[PDB]
Amino acid sequence: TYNTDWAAEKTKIRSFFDEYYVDNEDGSGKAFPYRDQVFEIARRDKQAIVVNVDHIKESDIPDALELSEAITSNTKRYEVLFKDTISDMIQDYLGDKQAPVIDALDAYMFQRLHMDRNLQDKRKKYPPQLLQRFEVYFTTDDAAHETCVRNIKATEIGHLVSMKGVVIRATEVKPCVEVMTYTCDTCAAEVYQPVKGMQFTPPVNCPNKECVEAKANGRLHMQLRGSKFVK
Amino acid sequence: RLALNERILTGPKGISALRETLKDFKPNPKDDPYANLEKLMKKYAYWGHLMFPKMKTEDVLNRVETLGTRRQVKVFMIKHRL
DNA sequence: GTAAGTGATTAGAGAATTGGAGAGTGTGT
Ligand SMILES: [Zn+2]
């Protein structure tokens, strides 16, 4: 009684990005603003897309209501599918060109992918949080999702919720770990560990098969030029 | 168990790999002999580290000097000198 | 003195004894 065919859902999501439009104010044509924002990410003038679920709900597309309900009911999963479809759209726009290097992690990734050269290998070697470098956020305006702090209870876990309130306390911005990278002493291999939640446990012993078979006992040392941080 | 032995010493990580490592080494005969010795000794250490990482360079060279008495290694050297 | 044959020595292989490393499992905090 569950659906896990991700390719069909990706097809639906990409059809939304292709076919949502707004008419030009002079009547000269149509704007396709979501794919314009995707191309802004592709040329690196941007870092995030904010998607309005009510636009999906009121779009002139088959299965639009079902897609909106699925997004609202399991939002923590559909973020991954939106990131995957935007990554495929970025590669279709970009072609054989390269996106510009702007920071040390971009320089490390662009240098290391061609060191590896000198899709199965890419997706097995690198986690998707490191391969994809943009943010996706959702919004709602319909009053069905309006609630108070008092009303958010056990039925709302995992769902998208909207509310309105006053800010009492706020901290300053801190660096938060997203992906750690370790390198072995003896065999010079690398380990990538993605982090979820507010804790992580670092691995100790090298997992690479040649190092393990040789019993070289190489330690793992963490490196922050390859590791990923977020505000 | 795991130990350095005649299969490893005659295998693709062994004496042929050391020969391939030594092909680029060309000391100057008019230079300091101790300096030339230092240059040679660290190439021995590099080959030993690739060939058997568990053990110190000193113990690796002692084990190679021991294993030279085996008949299999002698037959390998008889073929290899040609 | 030289050549051929036989005896002795040396080298390799097989079998048995001794010891130490490594891994697994159990117990205590
Ligand atoms: Zn290693």
Side-chain angles (χ1 to χ4, degrees), chain B residues 11-82:
Chain B
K13 294 183 182 181
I15 295 163
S16 53
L18 178 54
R19 185 173 183 179
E20 183 64 29
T21 309
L22 290 166
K23 283 181 187 174
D24 289 331
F25 179 50
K26 289 183 183 188
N28 186 11
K30 296 175 178 179
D31 208 348
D32 187 14
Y34 288 110
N36 290 345
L37 174 60
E38 194 166 41
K39 286 190 177 187
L40 171 59
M41 283 297 290
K42 250 165 186 170
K43 287 193 178 296
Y44 281 134
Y46 172 46
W47 169 75
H49 178 71
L50 289 177
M51 196 260 287
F52 200 78
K54 184 183 172 182
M55 216 159 54
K56 282 196 172 192
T57 305
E58 170 193 343
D59 296 341
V60 159
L61 295 172
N62 270 273
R63 181 62 168 191
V64 167
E65 196 179 57
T66 308
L67 288 177
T69 61
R70 301 284 205 259
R71 194 184 183 188
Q72 181 173 8
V73 187
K74 288 179 184 180
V75 167
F76 189 92
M77 286 299 298
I78 287 159
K79 296 193 178 188
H80 180 258
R81 283 176 182 123
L82 304 171

Side-chain angles (χ1 to χ4, degrees), chain A residues 108-131:
Chain A
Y108 161 77
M109 282 301 303
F110 178 69
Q111 189 262 10
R112 204 196 191 280
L113 284 163
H114 295 82
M115 179 264 188
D116 280 334
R117 185 257 165 204
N118 293 332
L119 294 170
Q120 295 96 317
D121 304 322
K122 180 177 181 178
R123 290 158 189 174
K124 282 181 177 185
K125 206 161 191 172
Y126 300 96
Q129 292 92 336
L130 202 53
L131 289 168

Side-chain angles (χ1 to χ4, degrees), chain A residues 70-89:
Chain A
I71 285 163
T72 308
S73 56
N74 200 12
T75 318
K76 196 64 171 174
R77 184 67 190 170
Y78 267 81
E79 185 198 331
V80 178
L81 307 183
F82 264 76
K83 278 176 176 167
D84 276 7
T85 44
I86 292 163
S87 184
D88 293 352
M89 283 183 66

Side-chain angles (χ1 to χ4, degrees), chain A residues 25-192:
Chain A
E25 297 193 321
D26 56 352
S28 62
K30 291 171 179 183
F32 294 83
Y34 285 113
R35 80 175 181 191
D36 291 343
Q37 292 180 23
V38 170
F39 300 156
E40 281 193 330
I41 289 190
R43 300 181 287 99
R44 308 202 70 194
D45 299 336
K46 219 185 195 69
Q47 269 287 281
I49 302 185
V50 181
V51 178
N52 198 311
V53 181
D54 302 336
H55 293 171
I56 305 179
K57 172 179 169 182
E58 301 187 1
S59 63
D60 299 335
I61 287 169
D63 316 331
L65 174 62
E66 190 197 48
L67 178 60
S68 72
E69 287 192 338
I71 285 163
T72 308
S73 56
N74 200 12
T75 318
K76 196 64 171 174
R77 184 67 190 170
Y78 267 81
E79 185 198 331
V80 178
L81 307 183
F82 264 76
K83 278 176 176 167
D84 276 7
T85 44
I86 292 163
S87 184
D88 293 352
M89 283 183 66
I90 282 160
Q91 277 182 19
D92 288 336
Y93 174 81
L94 190 62
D96 297 339
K97 303 181 182 182
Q98 311 300 324
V101 163
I102 296 175
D103 204 356
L105 196 134
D106 308 326
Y108 161 77
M109 282 301 303
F110 178 69
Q111 189 262 10
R112 204 196 191 280
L113 284 163
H114 295 82
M115 179 264 188
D116 280 334
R117 185 257 165 204
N118 293 332
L119 294 170
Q120 295 96 317
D121 304 322
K122 180 177 181 178
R123 290 158 189 174
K124 282 181 177 185
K125 206 161 191 172
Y126 300 96
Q129 292 92 336
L130 202 53
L131 289 168
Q132 302 169 350
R133 212 161 306 129
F134 54 91
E135 300 158 29
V136 178
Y137 301 114
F138 299 111
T139 48
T140 47
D141 300 318
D142 274 359
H145 309 301
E146 287 269 20
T147 49
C148 316
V149 175
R150 192 177 304 260
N151 308 127
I152 304 176
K153 284 172 175 177
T155 52
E156 315 306 308
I157 291 182
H159 290 57
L160 185 71
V161 171
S162 185
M163 65 172 212
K164 183 175 170 176
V166 202
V167 184
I168 302 184
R169 298 174 66 183
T171 70
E172 76 280 6
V173 175
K174 303 168 185 175
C176 173
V177 177
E178 184 148 290
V179 180
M180 285 302 305
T181 60
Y182 312 87
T183 312
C184 185
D185 281 317
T186 60
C187 72
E190 288 165 51
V191 181
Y192 303 89

